[PDB]
Amino acid sequence: MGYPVIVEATRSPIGKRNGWLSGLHATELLGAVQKAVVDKAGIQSGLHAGDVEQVIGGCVTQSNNISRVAWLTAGLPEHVGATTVDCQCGSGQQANHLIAGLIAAGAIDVGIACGIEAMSPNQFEAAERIAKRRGITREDVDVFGLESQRRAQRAWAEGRFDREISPIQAPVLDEQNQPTLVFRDQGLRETTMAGLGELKPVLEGGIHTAGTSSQISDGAAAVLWMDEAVARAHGLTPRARIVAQALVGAEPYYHLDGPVQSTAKVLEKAGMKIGDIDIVEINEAFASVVLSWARVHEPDMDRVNVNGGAIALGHPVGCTGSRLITTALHELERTDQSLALITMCAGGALSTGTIIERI
Amino acid sequence: SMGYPVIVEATRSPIGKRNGWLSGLHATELLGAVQKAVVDKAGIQSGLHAGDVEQVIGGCVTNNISRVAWLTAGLPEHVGATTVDCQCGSGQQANHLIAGLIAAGAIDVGIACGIEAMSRVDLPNQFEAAERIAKRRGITREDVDVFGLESQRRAQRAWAEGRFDREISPIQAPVLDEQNQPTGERRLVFRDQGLRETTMAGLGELKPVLEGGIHTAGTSSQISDGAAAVLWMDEAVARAHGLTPRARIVAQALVGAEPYYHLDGPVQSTAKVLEKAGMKIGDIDIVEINEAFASVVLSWARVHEPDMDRVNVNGGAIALGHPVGCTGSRLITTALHELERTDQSLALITMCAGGALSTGTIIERI
Ligand SMILES: [Cl-]
Ligand SMILES: [Cl-]
Ligand SMILES: [Cl-]
Ligand SMILES: [Cl-]
Ligand SMILES: [Cl-]
């Protein structure tokens, strides 16, 4: 029945933890972005908030995990590792895949996918295993981390993010809450090859530092989707379509290398190859994830995370899917290119891949 | 650093009704009792202790921040809002993860477990999908009532014959009075609480849960209290501790389900796991397909055409209850023990997972 297209996509600026957005309750920050995505659509159209038929938000990131607490409650030995599958990576692209599918199914004509990150075993270890596995060094990740920072700085200098960002009003917070608008990503960082060479690895025997991994950050994003002809009837312009999608199980012991599989599978579904893709957005939680993915697929690295990624911009993990779709779409439009691949970790030990085409 | 994962022990607690026999236990007490029982069972005839376990992985557990946000920005109340989450539980994911970590050589001994419980302090989206799945395949009110009656009969027969005795770890729980207040007493609970005398006439009288629907309380399962756990080892490590390998995973598959038919995943996950194993449906001796809704099972059956005498032979969730968060471990545990009881070789386990995923697993008794 339906033909889903993206008509508007927006993100908040990304704030540091305890930074410029920290004075907002998670519900207020998400709410601002839900409203902004509707208001953008309404600027030269008939669309109103009550025309949204379904909103689907990604799961929220969360030891006190029930498996461990149970194990201790029964008197069992404390050295034993216990974890509970939850929302470690966020749901990645799931909300956007579900909204688009519900439109294709003819269940709804208008939907919003959204996500939020705020004040509402182990990741570095996995990222180090992924590095050793394919000979990724300390120097390799420092080069990549420097480049993400440079590209994000260049992107900001040239105003590349101006279209995609909804400015957000937030309280002063910090030391005094008595005092009663944020435009820019706060995580952008004034570092160099030498600076990065000085940093101490986060794990003994590791290659990643604070400069080649991202920190958890405050952010929200949302994507408004519509059936194509309903968009046209309301005077709104179709901007992108999903060409193919994939949701795959990652390797239990290399759980952050999922993008390798999800990229492979979504390309196969599309009948495409890496070189066909103009723009890639692959989440930069860890530099080794991207370099690992790149060593298998050997893309042109000048097309990968063109405006920087999470190492420079921050990692609002709960909205990653919408954040990456938002950034990819606006970079396709800015350069007038046709195809983007978006890939990332999801849930626990899953990865999603999505190919979109600008229209 | 390449292991060979095998199941060495699997146990499940009886399944209690909501506010029933296990409700006075905190989630952590109920899960903890089952984690400990799976270790104690393995330690009866071996050298194993709890401290030899290297990793425990439990499934995800279980108002929307999406809706609260939408409301706090002043937006319309009639708009539906949901959050992708742990609606179906993680199904088989914890068992797949423990086995994978052993195969990768990361650990030699691990426990997969799951819990469903509710602090003393299925939704309409689901029934809607289940009704879509029924109409799509011409499944009627009469069809699902026949299936629901049969689940109850099988469960009753299984209980009468003691079929569940080996698998179940009895659990000590607070006695609750008529008003759901504790008396101070604690009693060992042995039996699944959800079984009920059912007839075709009784079922025919029930009111559908949704306007125009075919499912009732008697052909859908209610959320229940339960936990289950499966102890996995590398086979050589099992032998070195004096334990016998009992089961192994032949093939496994995880599929993304249709967004608008999100409960029909078992059709695809079954197809794919059979293909990976080089098998057909008639090779499988025992199937465990989770009975959240009768239409899901009958839809699956219409595509794959199994012999239904091999399907949920000891009853399923319609009769036994639906402790969602431990479904994967519960079905693996029931399937393994029914292979051992009958001396048969292969079982297929299939169910919903996360939100709009489905898993299929083929296991062999060894
Ligand atoms: Cl999102
Ligand atoms: Cl509880
Ligand atoms: Cl009892
Ligand atoms: Cl489980
Ligand atoms: Cl299920």
UniProtKB/Swiss-Prot annotation, chain B:
One Pfam annotation, family name? Answer: Thiolase_N
Q: Which domain of life is it from?
A: Bacteria
The molecular function terms in GO held by this entry are: acetyl-CoA C-acyltransferase activity; identical protein binding
Induction per UniProt is:
Induced by cholesterol and repressed by KstR.
| GO annotation, biological process | cholesterol catabolic process; fatty acid beta-oxidation; phenylacetate catabolic process
Q: What is its EC number?
A: 2.3.1.16
Give the pathway.
Answer: Steroid metabolism; cholesterol degradation
Catalytic residue list: 88 (acyl-thioester intermediate), 322 (proton acceptor), 352 (proton acceptor)
Tell me the SUPFAM superfamilies matching this sequence: Thiolase-like (SSF53901)
**Null phenotype?**
Cells lacking this gene display an attenuated disease phenotype with reduced colony-forming units in comparison to the wild-type. This mutant is unable to metabolize cholesterol to androst-4-ene-3,17-dione (AD) and androsta-1,4-diene-3,17-dione (ADD).
Q: What does this protein do?
A: Involved in the beta-oxidation of the cholesterol side chain. It is important for utilization of cholesterol as a sole carbon source in vitro and for full virulence in the chronic stage of mouse lung infection. Catalyzes the thiolysis of 3,22-dioxochol-4-en-24-oyl-CoA to yield 3-oxo-4-pregnene-20-carboxyl-CoA (3-OPC-CoA) and acetyl-CoA. Also able to use acetoacetyl-CoA (AcAcCoA) as substrate.
Q: What is its quaternary makeup?
A: Dimer of dimers.
Q: This protein is called what?
A: Steroid 3-ketoacyl-CoA thiolase
